[PDB]
């Protein structure tokens, strides 16, 4: 006997992509080699984010990129391991160079129209193998419809499951002191 509390406990994070894209398999091979034989911490972070599922890689927009291009960051390279989406609100697009997993049709056109350049994760390793002069970005993880229903309960101010919305659907008892109580 050994009197242990835990035994044969597994890991908690993904160790390989679940997708079977052939090109993504090549991209993992490149960065798995780079992370082993390079001291730059930028490479290790990029490798793990390639394994993540779609809900853990939310899209980023052109506006969010322009927000972080101030206060002395006009000359750095933006790297986003996700999709990049055009924003209809932004009227004037600044000049930038972006390395992203993929672009929408309109986002690519407007970036190069202003005088920019669109890169690729493989070209990024060829130009900046150590990731010097770069900044990483993420999308809003919690900005999803399904997240608003999480942890429903009294005094929580969450969103209920209703087949429609109107005065005939819920409200009434338990939502106003005029009919019994309130929550």
């Amino acid at each position: 006997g050994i009197d242990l509390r835990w035994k044969h406990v597994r890991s908690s994070h993904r160790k390989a992509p679940k997708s079977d894209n052939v090109y993504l398999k090549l991209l993992v091979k490149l960065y798995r080699f780079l992370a082993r034989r390079t001291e730059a911490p930028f490479n290790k972070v990029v490798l793990r984010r390639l394994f993540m599922s779609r809900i853990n890689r939310p899209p980023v927009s052109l506006s969010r990129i322009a927000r972080n291009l101030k206060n002395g960051n006009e000359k750095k390279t933006v790297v986003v391991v996700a999709t990049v989406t055009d924003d209809n609100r932004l009227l004037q697009v600044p000049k930038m160079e972006v390395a992203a997993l993929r672009f929408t049709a309109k986002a690519r056109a407007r970036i190069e129209a202003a005088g920019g350049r669109t890169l690729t994760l493989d070209q990024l390793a060829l130009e900046k193998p150590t990731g010097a002069n770069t900044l990483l970005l993420r999308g809003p993880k919690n900005a999803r419809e399904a997240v608003k229903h999480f942890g429903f309960g009294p005094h929580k101010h969450k969103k209920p499951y209703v087949r429609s919305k109107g005065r005939k659907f819920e409200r009434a008892r338990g939502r106003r002191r005029s009919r019994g109580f309130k929550v």
């Binding site: 229903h149 499951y161 209703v162 087949r163």
Partner: protein
């Protein structure tokens, strides 16, 4: 019998619905029939247009 956080169901399936089910397996067969009727009608009205103003 509800058990968890669910949406309240309303499925109108307590009558004898199985007696009246209308599957559509003749969608392509019917289309051929209409095309045979149009070109047959167009032949009868040789120089005239098919439709009306």
């Amino acid at each position: 019998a509800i058990k968890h956080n669910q949406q309240i169901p309303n499925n109108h399936f307590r009558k004898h619905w199985q007696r009246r089910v209308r599957c559509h397996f003749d969608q392509p067969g019917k289309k051929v029939t209409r095309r045979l009727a149009r070109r047959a009608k167009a032949a009868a009205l040789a120089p005239r247009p098919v439709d009306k103003l």
